[PDB]
Amino acid sequence: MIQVYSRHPAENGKSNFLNCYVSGFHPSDIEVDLLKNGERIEKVEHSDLSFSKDWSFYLLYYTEFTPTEKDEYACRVNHVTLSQPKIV
Amino acid sequence: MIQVYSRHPAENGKSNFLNCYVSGFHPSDIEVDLLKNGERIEKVEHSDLSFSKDWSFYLLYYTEFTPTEKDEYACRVNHVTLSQPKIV
Amino acid sequence: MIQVYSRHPAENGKSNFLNCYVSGFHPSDIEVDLLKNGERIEKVEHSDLSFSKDWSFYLLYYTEFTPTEKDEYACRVNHVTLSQPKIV
Amino acid sequence: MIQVYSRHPAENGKSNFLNCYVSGFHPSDIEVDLLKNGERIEKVEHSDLSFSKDWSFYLLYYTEFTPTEKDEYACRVNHVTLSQPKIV
Amino acid sequence: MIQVYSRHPAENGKSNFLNCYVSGFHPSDIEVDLLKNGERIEKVEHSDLSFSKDWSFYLLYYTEFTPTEKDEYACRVNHVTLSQPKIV
Amino acid sequence: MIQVYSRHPAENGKSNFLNCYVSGFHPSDIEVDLLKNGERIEKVEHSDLSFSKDWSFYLLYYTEFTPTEKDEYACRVNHVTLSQPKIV
């Protein structure tokens, strides 16, 4: 029983990894305005400019939270497994 | 029983990985305005400019959350498995 | 029983890893304003400009939090496992 | 209000003349501009003005470079005269 | 208010003349600009003006570099005259 | 209010002339600028003006560098004259 694993790659260049995993709440480039340039305005009342309310990543009420999760977050992954079982 | 695995690639160049995985709430390039340029305006009242309400990635009420999940997030993945079982 | 693992790669270049894992609440490039340039304004009242309310990453009410999770967060990962069991 | 008074009255024999041998990368008199004269501009986003990325005169992969050359660069220039008199 | 008075009246034999051998990377008279003259500009974001990244004259991978050359650079220039008289 | 009075009246034989052998990386007269003249600008963010990154004349990987050369650089220049008289 012979099991041979040979790996010798040549990477002739530079490697660049950016923003491998992005998730969650990330809004961007949002502009909200009221009366940006205002001239001769008699009255402004009851202006409501609220971007967001309460923030909570995990909100649970009377909950049974039992997840079984195996995860692997990365940019470059190498997984190699050699098995040579012998049973008599 | 002979099991041979030979891998020797040549990568003649540079590699660029960007934004491999994007998910979630990410709105962009949104503009909301009221009376951008305002001249001789007698009255502005009851203006409602709210981008969003409460934020919550996980919201569970009386829930049984039992997911069994194996996941692999990456940009470049290499998975190799050699098996040579012998049973008598 | 012979099990040989040979790995000798050549990386002819520089490696750059940036922002491997980003998550959570990260909003950016958001501008909210009211009456940016204001001239001859008689009255401004009841202005509400609140970006966010209470912040809480984990909020649990009457909850049983029992997750079984094995995770591996990284930029570059190398996982190698050689097994050669013998049973008689 | 933007007022620009730019004048380039006189040029005599500006560049690249009376040369025996010219080669390589020599671009000249190239102008790249975005919003050269701008007034009351609200938002400029995501502008890419990269001229070039990589400069490599010799880039060889698994190559056998054996050029044989005999070159004689013998130019002869006689009685060159450049005159730019200015009288005020 | 921006007022600019720029004048470049006289140039005589500016560059790259009477040369026996010119080679390599020699770009000239290249202008790259963004919003050269700007008034009342609110937001400038994410501007990339990178001219170049990497300068490598000899970049070889697994190469056999054996150039044989005999070169004679013998130019002859006689009686060159440059005159730029100015009278005020 | 920005007022700029810049004048460059006279240049005679500026650069790179009467040279026997010129090579390599020699860019000249390159101007890169962002918002050269700016008034009442609110926000400038994330500006990249990197000219270059890495300068390597000889970059070799697993290379056999055996160049054989015989070069004679013998230029002859006679009676060069540069005159820039100024009378006020």
Author numbering:
A (entry chain C), B (entry chain A), C (entry chain E), D (entry chain B), E (entry chain D), F (entry chain F): 6 to 93
Sentences from the paper on this structure:
High resolution structures, however, show that this polymorphism arises from the assembly of a common building block that is strikingly homogeneous and monomorphic.
The majority of these (69% of all data) describe a side-by-side 2PF arrangement, termed ΔΝ6-2PFa, which we were able to solve to 3.0 Å resolution. The density for ΔΝ6-2PFa was of sufficient quality to allow an unambiguous atomic model to be built for residues 6–93 of the ΔN6 chain (which constitutes residues 7–99 of the wt-β2m sequence). This model shows that the amyloid core of the β2m subunit is a hammer-shaped fold that is delineated by the single intramolecular disulphide bond (Cys25-Cys80) for which we see clearly resolved density in the structure. In protofilament #1, the termini are oriented ‘upwards’, i.e., away from the hammer motif, whilst in protofilament #2, the termini are oriented ‘downwards’, i.e., they fold back and pack alongside the hammer motif of the originating subunit. The ΔN6-2PFa and D76N-2PFa structures have a very similar structure. In each, protofilament #1 adopts a “termini up” conformation, whilst protofilament #2 adopts a “termini down” orientation. This involves both polar (residue N17 interacts with Y66 and Y67 in the adjacent protofilament), and charge-based interactions (including a salt-bridge between K19 and D59).
